[model samples]
Target: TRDANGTWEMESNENFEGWMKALDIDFALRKIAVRLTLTLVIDQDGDNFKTKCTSTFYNYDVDFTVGVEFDEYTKSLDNRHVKALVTWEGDVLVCVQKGEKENRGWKKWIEGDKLYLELTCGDQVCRQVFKKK
Candidate 1:
């Protein structure tokens, strides 16, 4: 079975820079970001959840409940304001970000002892795998 409750250290990431490019991130910042590893610290209780995405350059914290929509401003990330809605599809946590960007969303799930995150922007999908810490 898979578990989603814990601190997860990133094992590897794929095409994260491509996703950032689709977000219109600057070249300099993307260069730095591509070299950094991200860590996820997640806490969940029923339908409510708190998540922290940490890196050496930036940290983003989000708290939300399933099926709830909230106004989200991605401050340090893209500096974009968006309507964020989170939901569950089976055991996976899915998030849809409606904003200026097209086809933006993410899915997070656990497989065995690894946590997987897929970030989609435009046609690029950044896949990240994490191991429970």
Candidate 2:
């Protein structure tokens, strides 16, 4: 569950294929990403959480409370870094990434039948819709 500031627990399922394809990840990267298992380690306290995405190929960490701004570096994908802010739009969590690339960010939400995510980098916008199992 999440708090007022939107720090929450996270869970994942085994549907990496669609997510990889939506990103237009190359064959080599796709092979690695698809087979790669992601473990989300989240530590929550009040309205704050430190989240870490750990895998054999890559690792990422970000700590924040809702409506706060921070600098983020995504080292896995070509080592791209940015200043990001995350906030909630109703139940949906949205993030704006400000960096060298224009319109770079992501949005995540849960619909009645599925989970939806829109990822943008440069001019490429990719949408991935996931079914809950």
Candidate 3:
């Protein structure tokens, strides 16, 4: 149902420092991002998903569809243009960002009342676990 809307609050962040560094994110921004708890609001439809990320350091809103790709000009973090491709590998939402980076993408899925988000860059993988709020 498109009404499958929920908020996910950060419960744990693991090895984010290395992941951010791999993305070439500013040191100051990375410092702030690591300390601030990130909350995400996900609105899911048939194949479309709107995600909003809120943190003390920044806010981000992204809209894309599963099995489709979109041009995303990132903000508040790396201001780069990239093709954001998303798909469903089983129930997990898998993303592949095609750009200059060697390996770049993310995966998100819900398990019970918790949400798991894995961010990848180069060879670093950062895991952020969130609880349904």
Count of clashing pairs, candidate 3: 0
lDDT per residue as tens, model 1, 82-118: 8999987888889999999988989988887888899
TM-score of each: 0.94, 0.62, 0.92
Clashing residue pairs, backbone N/CA/C < 3 A, model 1: none
Model 2 CA deviation exceeding 4 Å by range:
1-30, 41-46, 111-115, 126-133
lDDT by residue for model 2 (1-133), tens: 1332222232444345544444445778877765676554556575576766677887778888768888887666646678888788877778898987777777767665455567776656666554433
**lDDT, candidates in the order shown:** 0.89, 0.63, 0.85
Best by lDDT: 1
Kindly provide the TM-score of model 3 when superposed on the true structure, using C-alpha atoms.
Answer: 0.92
Q: After superposition, how far is residue 41 of candidate 3 from its true place, in Å?
A: 0.8
Which scores better on TM-score, 1 or 2? 1
